[PDB]
Amino acid sequence: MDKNALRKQILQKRMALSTIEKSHLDQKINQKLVAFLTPKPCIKTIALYEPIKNEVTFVDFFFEFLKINQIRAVYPKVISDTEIIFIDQETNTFEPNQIDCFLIPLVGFNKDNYRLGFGKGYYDRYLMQLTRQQPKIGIAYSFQKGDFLADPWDVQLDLIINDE
Numbered sequence: 643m644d645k646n647a648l649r650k651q652i653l654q655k656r657m658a659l660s661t662i663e664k665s666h667l668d669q670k671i672n673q674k675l676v677a678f679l680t681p682k683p684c685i686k687t688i689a690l691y692e693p694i695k696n697e698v699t700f701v702d703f704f705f706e707f708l709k710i711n712q713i714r715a716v717y718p719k720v721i722s723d724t725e726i727i728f729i730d731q732e733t734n735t736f737e738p739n740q741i742d743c744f745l746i747p748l749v750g751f752n753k754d755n756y757r758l759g760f761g762k763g764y765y766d767r768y769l770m771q772l773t774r775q776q777p778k779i780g781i782a783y784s785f786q787k788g789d790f791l792a793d794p795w796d797v798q799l800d801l802i803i804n805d806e
């Protein structure tokens with residue numbers, strides 16, 4: 643349904659979310675997230691993101707679950723307008739394969755688990771460098787589901803953790 647039309651629609655529905663609901667959906671999601679990792683304590687370095695246009699938020703206790711398990715959290719930083727890189731708190735940059743798992747922010751997703759981002763293409767571009775079959779998990783509210791045809795360059799997400 644044209645990636646652009648489906649963006650404005652979902653993005654707007656997400657911006658109209660009430661604090662209490664958002665809170666109720668982020669809590670649920672962060673919990674499915676903690677229960678998602680524990681059963682495979684192999685992730686030593688994980689890719690997160692800094693919630694922006696009302697995206698799913700990462701809660702305090704989630705950051706604590708990573709703290710007591712010595713898991714490093716690296717975040718995306720746009721270099722120019724070409725590519726993005728991932729760095730940690732001390733600002734050291736970790737190469738693509740130094741990252742064991744990617745928790746990705748998104749606007750929408752279709753039945754084939756393809757992502758719909760801001761339209762820049764940084765993630766599709768980046769996530770092609772992963773040669774370790776690292777998990778590409780999309781984080782999102784259950785209503786971010788959308789019907790759109792994927793382009794040849796679109797990266798397919800392995801799992802889409804949502805409030806369900």
Ligand SMILES: Nc1nc(=O)c2c([nH]1)N=C[C@H](CNc1ccc(C(=O)N[C@@H](CCC(=O)O)C(=O)O)cc1)N2CO
Pocket residue numbers: 691692693694697718719720726747748759760762764765
């Ligand atoms: N929290 C988060 N959300 C994201 O979806 C996002 C992020 N992290 N992680 C890195 C990339 C970068 N996404 C970007 C999206 C848009 C523009 C951009 O074009 N900015 C406009 C601003 C609009 C304006 O004021 O005109 C510009 O042209 O300046 C840059 C980077 N990304 C994707 O998952």
Ligand SMILES: Nc1ncnc2c1ncn2[C@@H]1O[C@H](COP(=O)(O)OP(=O)(O)O)[C@@H](O)[C@H]1O
Pocket residue numbers: 645757758759760761762763764766767768770793795796
């Ligand atoms: N892996 C890639 N290599 C080269 N160009 C890309 C790649 N991925 C995306 N692009 C370009 O960047 C743009 C990103 O648009 P789009 O895929 O719709 O963004 P989004 O993933 O945020 O929905 C596309 O028009 C495309 O031409």
Ligand SMILES: [Mg+2]
Pocket residue numbers: 757758759763766795796797
């Ligand atoms: Mg794409």
